[PDB]
Amino acid sequence: MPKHEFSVDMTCGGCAEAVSRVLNKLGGVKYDIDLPNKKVCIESEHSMDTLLATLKKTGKTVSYLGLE
Amino acid sequence: PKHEFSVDMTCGGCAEAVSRVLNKLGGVKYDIDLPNKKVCIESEHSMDTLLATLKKTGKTVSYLGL
Numbered sequence: 001m002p003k004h005e006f007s008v009d010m011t012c013g014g015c016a017e018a019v020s021r022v023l024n025k026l027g028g029v030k031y032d033i034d035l036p037n038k039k040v041c042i043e044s045e046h047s048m049d050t051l052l053a054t055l056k057k058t059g060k061t062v063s064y065l066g067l068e
Numbered sequence: 069p070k071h072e073f074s075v076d077m078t079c080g081g082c083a084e085a086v087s088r089v090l091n092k093l094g095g096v097k098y099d100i101d102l103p104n105k106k107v108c109i110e111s112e113h114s115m116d117t118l119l120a121t122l123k124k125t126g127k128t129v130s131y132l133g134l
């Protein structure tokens with residue numbers, strides 16, 4: 001239910017696909033990826049901690065833009 | 069031991085991401101070739117560990133050999 005927003009420095013479509021893959025693997029998420037604006041929105045019951053950790057697995061620089 | 073992997077990187081940012089996860093793992097010496105989508109790693113870590121570390125990035129990875 002909570003709606004989180006993250007900054008992920010994706011710089012190509014492949015970067016976006018990889019973010020998609022780690023989120024798909026985690027599961028229990030509803031996400032939206034805005035490549036041009038380096039933003040990823042995630043609606044999930046998973047803690048912000050878990051979402052942050054999952055996104056960091058990509059090797060990309062990740063920051064929190066907060067709750068919607 | 070020098071392992072070679074195929075990693076589907078499509079921009080400099082993709083290579084940097086690979087570099088960061090390998091650095092986090094530690095104990096590795098590596099070289100990344102973006103145009104040829106290849107990553108070579110010399111480390112004491114096992115085959116599976118290196119593979120899992122690369123796979124967790126969300127990129128398509130396959131082992132090529134030694």
Ligand SMILES: OC[C@H]1O[C@@](CO)(O[C@H]2O[C@H](CO)[C@@H](O)[C@H](O)[C@H]2O)[C@@H](O)[C@@H]1O
Binds near residue numbers: 011012014015078079
């Ligand atoms: O995802 C990046 C990857 O896409 C390719 C096509 O395989 O190029 C596309 O994306 C570029 C931006 O990253 C565009 O400039 C280009 O016009 C478009 O075809 C690869 O060249 C690139 O590695």
